[PDB]
């Protein structure tokens, strides 16, 4: 009882491209050098607004609607920062050495030094962006990857409420399998041999472990900044943060 499984590869790709959230702007103001407080205010204000559009995007990912509210919530709570980050890296692909947080907020690694401990995170995002541009990552592959993160990241932490044993989530794994099929279709369609298809599938999925690592580092950095309470975080951003620690 899920439309997702009936979709062909072309239909899956088309639905995912159609789901894409808009590119948002940062709050104009040419006043330069940013301070630590300024930069963090800009980045968290942005991420707060991106979050609202991420929820709409999630609801348009084939198979996501078929889940219960609580499962949707669990998946989004687990993956939100990974999803913001891969989005950021994607946008930043054609600006080597820079992070395109917004069209009017293009930052270099030196600007990461504005915030204590942020440059490390900047350096990992930039490496991921170079890795994507060096792989010639395509928009169609990217939307597949981003949906895999949504469905995969929290899937192994559905534990029973008492006894906390892993609840098996067949629907989610079936949708994940459909997305894998869709990725291979894209690679075959781009002219890759079978060996090149499987090699590239692996390369792309291995990057998701680096993206998990960055999310965890960013989560700790975020939590650190809210403790020093430099920046006031939106309640939404605080609740997403609170789901982790």
């Amino acid at each position: 009882n899920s439309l997702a499984l009936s979709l062909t590869a072309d239909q899956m790709v088309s639905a995912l491209l159609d789901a894409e959230p808009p590119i948002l702007y940062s709050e104009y103001d040419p006043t330069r050098p940013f301070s630590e407080a300024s930069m963090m205010g800009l980045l968290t204000n942005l991420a707060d607004r991106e979050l609202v559009h991420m929820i709409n995007w999630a609801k348009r990912v084939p198979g996501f609607v078929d889940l219960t509210l609580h499962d949707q919530v669990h998946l989004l709570e687990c993956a939100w920062l990974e999803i913001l980050m891969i989005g950021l890296v994607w946008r930043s692909m054609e600006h080597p050495g820079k992070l395109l947080f917004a069209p009017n907020l293009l930052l270099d690694r030196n600007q990461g030094k504005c915030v204590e401990g942020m440059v490390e995170i900047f350096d990992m995002l930039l490496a991921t962006s170079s890795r994507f541009r060096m792989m010639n990552l395509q928009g169609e592959e990217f939307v597949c990857l981003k949906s895999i993160i949504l469905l995969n990241s929290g899937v192994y932490t559905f534990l029973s409420s008492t006894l906390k044993s892993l609840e098996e989530k067949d629907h989610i794994h079936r949708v994940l399998d459909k997305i894998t099929d869709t990725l291979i279709h894209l690679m075959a369609k781009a002219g890759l041999t079978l060996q090149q298809q499987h090699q590239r599938l692996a390369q792309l999925l291995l990057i998701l472990s680096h993206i998990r690592h960055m999310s965890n580092k960013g989560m700790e950095h975020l939590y650190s900044m809210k403790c020093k309470n430099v920046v006031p975080l939106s309640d939404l951003l605080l609740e997403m943060l609170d789901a982790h620690r």
Binding site: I55, L69, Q72, V73, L76, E239
Partner: peptide, 10 residues
């Protein structure tokens, strides 16, 4: 009570 709840519920 979660903001996520109503954003999801719309």
């Amino acid at each position: 009570h979660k903001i996520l709840h109503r954003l999801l519920q719309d």
